[PDB]
Design a protein around this ligand. Structure first.
Ligand code: NA
Ligand code: NA
Length: 265
């Protein structure tokens, strides 16, 4: 019978926003397809998952034999004239496609997000199939005074980076909606600014266990709060299942700052 498979040979199915996720959809083509009019595959991703309609490939069927339409729920419909499937009667059609996570609702962090699809022959639907669920994580932080950790600080700016071997090796770009990329370009870096409550966060990150060997996430201060010294070194953090959703923002990881003298205007 029909199936949709997440192609991910790990015990944990965590992804960073924007990373490609590989799926296979297998749908039965009936014995009598040649006597039908149309074969439809509709993909209905759960909220947070975007299907990349440009990546669809159907084994044994050229792109000029079917139509792909992108839909409002961020999935798609494949429409195949039944005559084009005559050689597939009684066999399984294999469609491959990619998706990616794009988070517009932060309540989706640390929740399982499946893909779903339904094949239909003329008006008669097959049962909906679902893939395994994918997840994305995050981390919350609070900028505070190092000698009075109850005092939260406005105006700090922090970049998201990756450290390895005692150095910053990669800089993040993007965000949990648009997706992240990480490379050696220290410009247009993903940055957050604190308000009076000191809070900031980075959401839509895969778990630290999924980073390359030796890598850690870190946040790098690039503007100090008023009256404080810019930190010398990045601040390491860990992302795990539920590290984001189980803490209120005011209970984020505390980052200490030290006061500094002023200047004469
Ligand atoms: Na298929
Ligand atoms: Na999924």
């Amino acid at each position: 019978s029909d199936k949709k498979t997440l192609n991910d040979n790990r015990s944990h199915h965590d992804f960073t926003a924007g990373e490609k996720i590989n799926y296979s959809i297998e749908t039965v083509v009936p014995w009598n397809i040649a006597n039908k009019k149309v074969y439809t595959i509709t993909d209905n991703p759960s909220k947070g998952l975007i299907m990349d309609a440009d990546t669809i490939q159907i084994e044994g069927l050229a792109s000029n034999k079917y139509t792909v339409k992108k839909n409002a729920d961020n999935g798609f419909t494949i429409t195949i004239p039944a005559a084009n499937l005559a050689a597939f009667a009684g066999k399984t059609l294999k469609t491959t496609v990619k998706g990616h996570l794009s988070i517009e609702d932060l309540t989706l962090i640390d929740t399982g997000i499946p893909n779903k699809a339904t094949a239909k022959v003329d008006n008669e639907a097959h049962h909906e199939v679902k893939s395994e669920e994918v997840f994305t994580g995050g981390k919350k932080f609070v900028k505070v005074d190092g000698s009075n950790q109850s005092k939260t600080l406005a105006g700090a700016q922090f970049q998201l980076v990756i450290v390895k071997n005692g150095q910053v090796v990669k800089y993040a770009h993007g965000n949990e909606k648009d997706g992240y990329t990480f490379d050696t370009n220290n410009t247009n870096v993903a940055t957050k600014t604190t308000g009076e409550n000191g809070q900031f966060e980075f959401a839509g990150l895969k778990y630290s266990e999924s980073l390359e060997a030796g890598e850690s996430y870190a946040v790098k201060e690039v503007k100090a709060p008023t009256g404080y010294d810019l930190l010398k070194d990045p601040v390491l953090f860990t992302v795990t299942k539920d590290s984001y959703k189980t803490v209120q923002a005011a209970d984020g990881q505390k980052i200490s700052n030290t006061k500094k003298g002023g200047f004469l205007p």
